[PDB]
Design a binder for this molecule. Structure first.
Ligand SMILES: CCc1nc(N)nc(N)c1-c1ccc2ccc[n+](CCCOC)c2c1
Length: 329
């Protein structure tokens, strides 16, 4: 089973799922960086403008709904949501699974007014599930229907398909060469060992090794403030409140950046990490790489998001607790 995804500004990738009977449609980000499922709730006060602007799940319209009510709070690096647990039938790419999810009743304007999607579908391990709720992929696996215990991601560059997630396998149509795997530091987190980071010809970062969170729910490639300050100075990038910029005319001249993962160099070009929306030396261009201090136990860790996935098709192998990368096509 595959799910078609929409690409919004190269920063948000989402597809649709149905919840309840009849199905209530929602735009959701399939996020390997979290493990819970949630959508905005009809019980969300309209004082929360973000709830006025998104699709709200209304339990009172679903005959397959099952009440639970346990409260939960989901904390992401760029924001937080709070609400309660509910159960209903979810439809994902033709697959139907009974699933427990969060009905969000508190959704902050910043940053959710800026979200094109309504909710999130965690693709992480149950070990990271808030409220110890069974992750949706686990529940789909218990149906013994998928050919393989894996799922893959394809994030296209913006255009005008935006992206594609395959449940149970990979789509040869979107990658060339063969995969190259790296085992997880440990099951429970889509995180792997990173042997080094280099800017141009000089592994001036992550010597001695570091951690890499392969996050489909993250827009950019992130590192610790420390690491990024170093990387950026090398790029001659000026730091702003939320991002780093360069004079647009300097974008094309920026050096390559490579990530040493499992004995293989994954290199990004300036075209791969700068939003070149001009060549003017009188305009600033943002970089698709940010400083993001991720706390323990997961962090400090680097995070490989959409910026990286765009270039490398990614397969998340549950059965072998490994991640595979291949040249996206
Ligand atoms: C998908 C949920 C999510 N997962 C992870 N692992 N990290 C985040 N920072 C967010 C998170 C939260 C709020 C956002 C509000 C606006 C835009 N984004 C970026 C969406 C990424 O699409 C790939 C957001 C991302």
């Amino acid at each position: 089973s595959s799910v078609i995804l929409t690409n919004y500004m190269d920063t948000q990738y989402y597809g649709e799922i149905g919840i309840g009977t009849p199905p209530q449609t929602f735009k959701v980000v399939f996020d390997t960086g979290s493990s819970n499922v949630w959508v905005p709730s009809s019980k969300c006060s309209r004082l929360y403008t973000a709830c006025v602007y998104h699709k709200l799940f209304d339990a009172s319209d679903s005959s397959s709904y099952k009440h639970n009510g346990t409260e939960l709070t989901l904390r992401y690096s760029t924001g937080t949501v709070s609400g309660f647990l509910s159960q209903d039938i979810i439809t994902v790419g033709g697959i139907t699974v009974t699933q427990m999810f969060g009905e969000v009743t508190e959704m902050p304007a910043l940053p959710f007014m800026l979200a094109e999607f309504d909710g999130v579908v965690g693709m992480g391990f149950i070990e990271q599930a808030i409220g110890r709720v069974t992750p949706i992929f686990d529940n789909i696996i218990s149906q013994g229907v998928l050919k393989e215990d894996v799922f893959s991601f394809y994030y296209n560059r913006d255009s005008e398909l935006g992206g594609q997630i395959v449940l149970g396998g990979s789509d040869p149509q979107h990658y060339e060469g063969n995969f190259h795997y790296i085992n997880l530091i440990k099951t429970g987190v889509w995180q792997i060992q990173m042997k080094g980071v280099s800017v141009g010809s000089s592994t001036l970062l992550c010597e001695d090794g570091c951690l890499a969170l392969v996050d489909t729910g993250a827009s950019y490639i992130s590192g610790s403030t420390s690491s990024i300050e170093k990387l950026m100075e090398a790029l001659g990038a000026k730091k702003r409140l939320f991002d780093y910029v360069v004079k647009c005319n300097e974008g094309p001249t920026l050096p390559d950046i490579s990530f040493h993962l499992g004995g293989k160099e994954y290199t990004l070009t300036s075209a791969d990490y700068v939003f070149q929306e001009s060549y003017s030396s009188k305009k600033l261009c943002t970089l698709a790489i940010h400083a993001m201090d991720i706390p323990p136990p997961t962090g400090p860790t680097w995070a490989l998001g959409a910026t990286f996935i765009r270039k490398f098709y990614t397969e998340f192998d549950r059965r072998n607790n490994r991640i595979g990368f291949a040249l996206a096509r």
